[PDB]
Design a protein around this ligand. Structure first.
Ligand SMILES: CCCCCCCC/C=C/CCCCCCCC(=O)OC[C@@H](O)CO
Ligand SMILES: CCCCCCCC/C=C/CCCCCCCC(=O)OC[C@H](O)CO
Ligand SMILES: CCCCCCCC/C=C/CCCCCCCC(=O)OC[C@H](O)CO
Ligand SMILES: CCCCCCCC/C=C/CCCCCCCC(=O)OC[C@H](O)CO
Ligand SMILES: CCCCCCCC/C=C\CCCCCCCC(=O)OC[C@H](O)CO
Ligand SMILES: *C/C=C(C)/C=C/C=C(C)/C=C/C1=C(C)CCCC1(C)C
Length: 226
């Protein structure tokens, strides 16, 4: 039942929240890295605690379920993750411009992606639901474009962080593209798959996006001399 994956996430995210803070490197730019990558699983563990106990679980007239705790989790964890990716490109340089601006612009596009994704879930099957789905994907495209074109240009102007940035962005892009696919196939969208199947896939996605990525992103940046 759905109660099992929610508890699994709560224990995995809470334990990983401390495990990342303990094992995470506290050297220079990596200090704020593990600090942000320790808050992300702590926010997720709190959300899985809410879903497990029913805080925010909205049920519509057609039987669809909207997890308000999940989207608030995404609304704050995904901007913190992008904040660390954009900041990692500015690592080791005090002479480059746009750090505060790029983070601000990409967080705006990410929050709109998550908020409009919440409106789509709440909407019934129709035009209103899929219009905000396409507008959410449009904002997602702007996050990816910004990540790939502009801030990789900032990383490339100094090695060897540039290959470490490109490897972390490639992992994040493939991982985050799975999320809207689960939305469409699950009850929130087309309802091709059951609600419990979406909970299980989002569990493995979140563990990959918040626990596993936190350790591979650190390993890549660890090699660069900054
Ligand atoms: C790196 C890209 C991402 C890779 C991983 C992507 C897939 C992650 C998913 C993991 C498990 C998916 C399958 C989960 C299947 C769950 C089915 C289930 O609980 O059924 C309940 C009732 O319907 C029974 O009647
Ligand atoms: C390197 C680390 C990688 C970590 C990430 C890879 C994880 C692999 C997949 C696991 C998910 C398994 C999903 C199982 C879905 C069915 C579960 C089920 O039916 O549970 C029993 C039920 O609760 C009682 O009736
Ligand atoms: C330099 C600036 C740094 C700023 C750092 C960012 C702020 C961190 C915020 C975390 C919020 C965590 C919220 C966790 C929400 C869990 C789910 C929940 O509360 O759901 C309620 C439900 O919707 C009722 O029906
Ligand atoms: C780096 C940190 C970045 C932090 C960024 C934080 C952004 C928070 C988003 C706010 C959207 C608020 C409005 C969301 C839309 C309303 C959804 C809602 O509350 O729905 C209730 C439901 O319909 C009842 O039945
Ligand atoms: C650039 C931003 C990201 C862009 C990429 C993300 C959007 C993906 C969209 C569709 C995926 C396809 C989903 C396929 C769902 C099939 C549903 C189906 O066949 O439903 C049958 C029926 O509903 C039985 O009840
Ligand atoms: C740790 C949790 C993560 C990384 C969650 C990510 C979620 C998304 C990238 C969701 C994207 C969506 C769209 C682009 C369109 C449909 C609505 C969403 C919110 C599922």
């Amino acid at each position: 039942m759905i109660q099992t994956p929610l508890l699994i996430g709560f224990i995995v995210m809470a334990l990983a929240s401390l495990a990342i803070y303990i094992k995470g490197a506290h050297y220079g730019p990596l200090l704020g890295h593990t600090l942000i990558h320790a808050a992300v699983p702590f926010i997720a563990a709190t959300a899985y605690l809410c879903m497990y106990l029913g805080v925010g679980n909205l049920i519509k007239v057609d039987g669809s379920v909207t997890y308000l705790a999940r989207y608030v989790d995404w609304a704050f964890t995904t901007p913190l993750l992008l904040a660390g990716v954009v900041s990692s490109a500015y690592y080791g340089t005090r002479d480059l411009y746009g750090k505060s601006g790029y983070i601000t612009a990409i967080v705006t596009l990410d929050v709109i992606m998550i908020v409009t994704g919440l409106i789509a879930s709440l909407a019934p099957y129709g035009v209103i639901k899929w219009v905000f789905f396409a507008w959410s994907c449009a904002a997602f495209a702007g996050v990816l474009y910004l990540l790939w074109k502009p801030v990789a240009s900032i990383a490339s102007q100094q090695p060897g962080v540039s290959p470490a940035y490109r490897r972390n962005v490639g992992f994040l892009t493939v991982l985050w593209l799975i999320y809207p696919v689960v939305f469409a196939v699950g009850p929130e969208g087309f309802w091709a798959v059951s609600d419990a199947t979406t909970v299980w896939v989002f569990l493995v996605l979140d563990v990959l996006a918040k626990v596993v990525y936190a350790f591979t992103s650190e390993r890549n940046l660890r090699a660069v001399p900054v």
